[PDB]
Amino acid sequence: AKKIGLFYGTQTGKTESVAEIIRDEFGNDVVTLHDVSQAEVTDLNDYQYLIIGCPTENIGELQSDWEGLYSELDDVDFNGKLVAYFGTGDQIGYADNFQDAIGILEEKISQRGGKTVGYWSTDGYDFNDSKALRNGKFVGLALDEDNQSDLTDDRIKSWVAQLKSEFGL
Ligand SMILES: Cc1cc2nc3c(=O)[nH]c(=O)nc-3n(C[C@H](O)[C@H](O)[C@H](O)COP(=O)(O)O)c2cc1C
Numbered sequence: 001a002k003k004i005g006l007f008y009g010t011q012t013g014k015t016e017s018v019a020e021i022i023r024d025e026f027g028n029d030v031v032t033l034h035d036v037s038q039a040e041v042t043d044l045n046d047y048q049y050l051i052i053g054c055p056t057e058n059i060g061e062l063q064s065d066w067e068g069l070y071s072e073l074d075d076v077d078f079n080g081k082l083v084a085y086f087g088t089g090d091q092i093g094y095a096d097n098f099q100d101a102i103g104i105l106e107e108k109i110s111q112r113g114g115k116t117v118g119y120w121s122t123d124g125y126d127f128n129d130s131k132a133l134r135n136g137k138f139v140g141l142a143l144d145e146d147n148q149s150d151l152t153d154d155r156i157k158s159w160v161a162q163l164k165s166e167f168g169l
């Protein structure tokens, strides 16, 4: 199995499109993509480095497929693993709940032993509140393909460089 397991959910495809950009950005072929509508909870056991991708749905909720997997995470042993988070979200439509989902996921996985890496500055986003907030920073990369599509490629470039360091790749 490849070094990095990237587990994403999507309804309208934008999280999946970002996921593929992230995979490519690593340059070297070190990522396997998993759609969580199709994946099993035990697939996470296969990787030391995890990337978790999730948009926020229904105003502050986990994406439906990630909702399903989340209820199965209380058993999984994340101890010693390193975990990064990315989300797509809409900071103009949902200013009070922007990227809530990666914060919900990170709260759960960090409690199970998985160490968060790849925190991301909140600079250049216009939002009011977020469960992904971690003191000046989001728990992971915030993408917005609704409002800031023109910023996605450069944000991914910069974030992947950071993760490569954290994963020692
Ligand atoms: C009804 C609905 C509610 C949403 N609520 C939020 C929200 O609470 N926070 C947020 O950041 N984005 C919210 N969004 C925007 C989506 O998260 C954003 O469009 C995301 O890219 C969709 O991902 P997908 O195309 O992979 O399904 C909402 C979108 C819809 C249609």
Ligand SMILES: [Mg+2]
Pocket: 111
């Ligand atoms: Mg405990």
